[PDB]
Nucleic acid binder design. Structure first.
Ligand code: MG
Ligand code: MG
Ligand code: MG
Ligand code: ZN
Lengths: 138, 208, 79, 116, 127, 100, 59
RNA sequence: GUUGGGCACUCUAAGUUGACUGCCGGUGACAAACCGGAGGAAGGUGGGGAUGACGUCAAAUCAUCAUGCCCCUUAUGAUUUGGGCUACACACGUGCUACAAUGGACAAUACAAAGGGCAGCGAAACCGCGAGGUCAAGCAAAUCCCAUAAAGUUGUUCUCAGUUCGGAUUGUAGUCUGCAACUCGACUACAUGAAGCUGGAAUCGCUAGUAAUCGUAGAUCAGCAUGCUACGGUGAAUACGUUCC
RNA sequence: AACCUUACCAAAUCUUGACAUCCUUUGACAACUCUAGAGAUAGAGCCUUCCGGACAAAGUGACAGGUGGUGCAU
């Protein structure tokens, strides 16, 4: 695929195509751009910088596979599934960060993740917690 | 496994519509006309060994063309029988109709003629097995690349049904080049209704 | 009726009500015509409507005006 | 209070009138056309004279009590003469030619599962 | 003078005529950002230039019909890219390496009987 | 300009093409000032049936009925070409329609 | 009660709304195409036999 | 682009070219074949259909039709009117509408495809709030009509509520069709405004222009579609991989 | 699936019949009105005209008719 017009990044477009509902790329585009505007408003610095820091935080490094009773055995996450899960959890836990507008939701989610807080980081550490707990089965 | 009629598969590819006329609107009359002609030829068809009729229409004329291998029985000797046909047929239609008897030699190579024959044999209470055997025998002597035959129903007066078929040669249905001539007929046997299907494939040619 | 050009009523019924204008008070009047509307010219005339199996009597009132005999000839005998 | 109900106050006049039984959106817009006030306004911030114009206007309509009484009177008429519609009212079944087999949970009410 | 192209993409046809100029682009007697809402559309439009450093050396006029803005714009992109060869046949190799000349055959599929769409079958239940 | 225009409607391209070629050559043989053969968008209807007798609506058979349309004009007529067009009542499965 | 109703539809009727189409060779009301005045079955029969112009199974 | 003019371009549609492991390298029994590459619009049956072997399920159909045997034949046949196939304590299946801010309402503005049309398609103008009505143009089609595509975009507003959500139900008044809309058509205007805050055990579909979503068209058809068949617009996520069902 | 469709039910009606092939009387035919009927229906008309085939009825017994059963005879 390609990078985005305003910022020239692959991840932004890959994230638009995951926020997008029913192929409303422009709606998703609007709300993500306004979120970058609003996270430049609050916590004044570059939207890409804060965003990339956010995904560096929440993007995990381990995973589990459920097999057999049912063991759940750890495994090293692929570097593509890394960004995949990061962006997915970012969007979803934004959507359930529960306030008025999704741009505000997203802004707060990237903000909290940038400061290593937020539901996405919670899921990350849950994942690693259950992984190391199940480390015996590797 | 519920397979289709190959003539229906091939129409518009290697063989053409037997009805060869246009009408923007009035199929609602003209197609029923075509069918009623197709039915009225019961007269000939009962004995005259007619394979198929093609039909063409114009502003003035109808031009019909009946294929057979015993054409004498439809033209009388000089024309008495075709004129007998024109009278009643044109009375039905109410339009000027000119006909064209046309000959297909080699009558034991034509699907509907084989089917008609085996039906009348089985009404005369012969044996399905010998019938299909000798049909394919004579067809292969006439030099066809493939024949297939099938009869289905209450064979031998049996209490229940069967489907028996024979073949010799190649009958490549899924090939669309192949101009395989299929025909179905029936036989109102004293026990029930025997349904006969027959298939010939007499080498490969295109209409173009 | 659904439209405003003229209501509807069967002639063989209206002719007979108008015949029965004199109000002899012994009269009923039978019909299979559940399709009929009820003009104000029917008030008091008891009608015998065919429900599908039976001629049911109905008395007519000043509230039954914009209505139909079928509305008061029940058909499905549920209980 | 306008039709006896002190309609909501933070809202705009249109929607706050919509919480009158008998006054929907069409009539709200017409009423505000009649008594000249922009619908963008709000009942708390109004001039009381405008509010009085509105109430004078509204008085010329069938509203809460009269409307319920009129509707139930029309209904009970046909219930009494026992039309098809009147009986379907009497029995809590739908009236408008609907199907009473799988649907009609509204007029019926909740499920009452019988054993097969 | 002119250098012309006929881009097509997803039931949308675009007739491009590159000419030298400033960077303007008109589309059915209208400007781009007038006509098209988005901007990644315009990125895709201008990407063939970006492959060859030809960003501002040409204006564009296009006559277009069919479909909707996105594929309409990819068709603009394609006709532009193909006209660039009529202007400069040696850019063929860069447009090859980048895969810019392929007319996307990705057309909408035929609904099929028994299905509610091209692939989607109805909801099935044994019981 | 002073032109004949003729429409051919046919259910088959490999016969309407030859009929068109006949009439075209006859006009530019018995006259002059002829337009080309002009294809028109070729209508097609489609009737869809269920392959069955009783039920099984899930299975279908879709039949198309094409209708090819081919237009020609004869610019600036002469009676020779008029006559050699109207004196060609051929073939069967094609509706010709003159317009003058 | 087929052939009676065949006669019946082939007759005129007391008002035009009652007039319904059925296929002319098989007295079948449903799945009639009023161009051909044929039902779906007989349409297949005849178009397979080649007795209906234009027609060709598609795609 | 209408009209004078050109048929260049698009397009239309007949013929043709094109793609075949055809070529380069490596692998491999040197063979088939695989992997990669070039070229090329496209590459590895390009994508999608059509085509469904012998036969299994005494599967379905005697209500498409045809037909053996059996049965009724002043009635199990035939004619009309009216009713019913539309019931209603309940259960199952298939779908539609929603349970809203990625949204609702209002205003302006933009880009399609495939199809239908003769006693039928009904532009414009006008009347009606709207369903629609009067007149009446063009049109048997690449002419004219159906037919403004909607989502989208640009603004404003509403600001988290059983709500300006949703639009069931019922009341009144109307429009079209029709021989007539009670049972039993659709539609409109007004009024009302229910259940419902994303669904338990279970379970379905889908590997790309797909899924998802938004509109459109058509057969049947006087009239009636959330159904069926067909069309385009926007447009993904992922495929580690075969341990499990 | 408003009527018809509709096969079902109620009421009302017919019994070579709503439909076909045959004999013969015949004949060209009727359309379109009015009374009564719920309608089918009869009943008055209206003057329909051999173009030996054709339309139209009428007596006739052969006969029709059956969405009636068996899809485990086909
Ligand atoms: Mg194959
Ligand atoms: Mg069985
Ligand atoms: Mg009836
Ligand atoms: Zn039929």
């Amino acid at each position: 695929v390609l990078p985005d017009p305003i910022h020239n990044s692959k991840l932004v477009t890959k994230l638009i195509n995951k926020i997008m509902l029913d192929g409303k790329r422009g709606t998703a585009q609007r709300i993500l751009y306004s979120a970058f505007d609003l996270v430049e408003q609050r916590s004044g610095r570059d939207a890409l910088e804060v965003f990339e820091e956010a995904i560096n935080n929440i993007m995990p490094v381990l995973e589990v596979k459920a097999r057999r009773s049912n063991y759940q055995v750890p495994v090293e996450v692929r570097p593509e599934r890394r960004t995949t899960l990061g962006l997915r959890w970012l969007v979803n836990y934004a959507r359930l960060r529960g306030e008025k507008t999704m741009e505000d939701r997203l802004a707060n989610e990237i903000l909290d993740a940038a400061n290593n807080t937020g539901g996405a980081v919670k899921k990350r550490e849950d994942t690693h917690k259950m992984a190391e707990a199940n480390k015996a089965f590797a | 496994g519920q397979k289709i009629n190959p003539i229906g598969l091939r129409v518009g590819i290697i063989r053409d519509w037997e009805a060869k006329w246009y009408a923007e609107k009035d199929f609602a009359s003209l197609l029923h006309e075509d069918l009623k002609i197709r039915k009225f030829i019961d007269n000939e068809l009962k004995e005259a060994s007619v394979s198929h009729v093609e039909i063409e229409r114009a502003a003035n004329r109808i031009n019909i063309a009946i294929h057979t291998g015993k054409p004498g029985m439809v033209i009388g000797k000089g024309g008495s029988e075709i004129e007998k046909l024109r009278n009643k047929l044109n009375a039905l239609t109410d339009k000027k109709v000119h006909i064209n008897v046309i000959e297909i030699k080699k009558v034991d190579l034509d699907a509907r003629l084989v089917a008609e024959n085996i039906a009348r044999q089985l009404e005369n209470r012969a044996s399905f097995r010998r019938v299909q055997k000798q049909a394919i025998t004579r067809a292969m002597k006439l030099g066809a690349k493939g024949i297939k035959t099938q009869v289905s129903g209450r064979l031998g007066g049996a209490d229940i049904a069967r489907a028996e078929q024979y073949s010799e040669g190649t009958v490549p249905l899924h090939t669309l080049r192949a101009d395989i001539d299929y025909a179905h007929a029936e036989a109102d046997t004293t026990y029930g209704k025997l349904g006969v299907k027959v298939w010939i494939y007499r080498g490969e040619v295109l209409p173009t | 009726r659904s439209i405003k050009k003229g209501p509807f009523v069967d002639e063989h019924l209206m002719k007979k009500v108008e015949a029965q204008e004199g109000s002899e008070k012994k009269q009923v009047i039978k019909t299979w015509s559940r399709r009929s509307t009820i003009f104000p010219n029917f008030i008091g005339h008891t009608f015998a409507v065919y429900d599908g199996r039976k001629h049911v009597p109905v008395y007519v009132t000043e509230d039954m005006v914009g209505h139909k005999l079928g509305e008061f000839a029940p058909t499905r005998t549920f209980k | 209070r306008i039709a006896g109900v002190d309609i909501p106050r933070e809202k705009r006049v249109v929607i706050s009138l919509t919480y009158i039984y008998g006054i929907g959106t069409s009539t709200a817009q017409k009423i505000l056309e009649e008594a000249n006030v922009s619908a963008d306004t709000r009942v708390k911030d109004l001039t009381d004279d405008e509010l009085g114009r509105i109430r004078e206007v509204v008085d010329g309509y069938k509203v809460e009590g009269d409307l319920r009484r009129e509707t139930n009177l029309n209904i009970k008429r046909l219930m009494e003469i026992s039309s098809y519609r009147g009986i379907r009212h009497r029995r809590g079944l739908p009236v408008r030619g609907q199907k009473t087999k799988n649907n009609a949970r509204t007029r019926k009410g909740p499920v009452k599962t019988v054993a097969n | 003078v002119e250098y012309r192209g006929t881009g097509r993409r997803k039931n949308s046809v675009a007739r491009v005529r590159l000419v030298p100029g400033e960077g303007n682009i008109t589309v059915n007697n209208r400007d781009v950002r007038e006509y098209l809402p988005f901007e990644s559309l315009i990125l895709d439009l201008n990407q063939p230039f970006d492959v060859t450093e030809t960003k501002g050396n040409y204006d564009v006029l296009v006559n277009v019909h069919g479909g909707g803005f996105t594929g309409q714009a990819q068709a603009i992109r394609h006709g532009i890219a193909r006209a660039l060869l009529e202007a400069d046949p040696e850019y063929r190799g860069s447009l090859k390496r980048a895969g810019l000349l392929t007319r996307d055959p990705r057309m909408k599929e035929r609904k099929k009987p028994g299905l509610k769409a091209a692939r989607r079958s109805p909801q099935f239940s044994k019981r | 300009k002073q032109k004949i225009r003729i429409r051919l409607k046919a259910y088959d391209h490999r016969v309407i093409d030859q009929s068109a070629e006949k009439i075209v050559e006859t006009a530019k043989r018995s006259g002059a000032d002829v337009s080309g053969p002009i294809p028109l968008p070729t209508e097609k209807s489609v009737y869809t049936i269920i392959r069955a007798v009783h039920k099984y609506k899930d299975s279908r058979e879709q039949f198309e009925q094409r209708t090819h349309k081919r237009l020609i004009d004869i610019v600036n007529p002469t009676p020779k070409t008029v006559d050699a067009l109207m004196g060609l009542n051929l073939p069967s499965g094609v509706d010709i329609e003159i317009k003058l | 009660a087929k052939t009676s109703m065949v006669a019946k539809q082939q007759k005129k009727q007391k008002y035009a709304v009652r007039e319904y189409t059925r296929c002319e060779r098989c007295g079948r009301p449903h799945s009639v195409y009023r161009k051909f005045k044929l039902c779906r079955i007989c349409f297949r029969e005849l178009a397979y036999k080649g007795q209906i112009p234009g027609v060709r199974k598609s795609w």
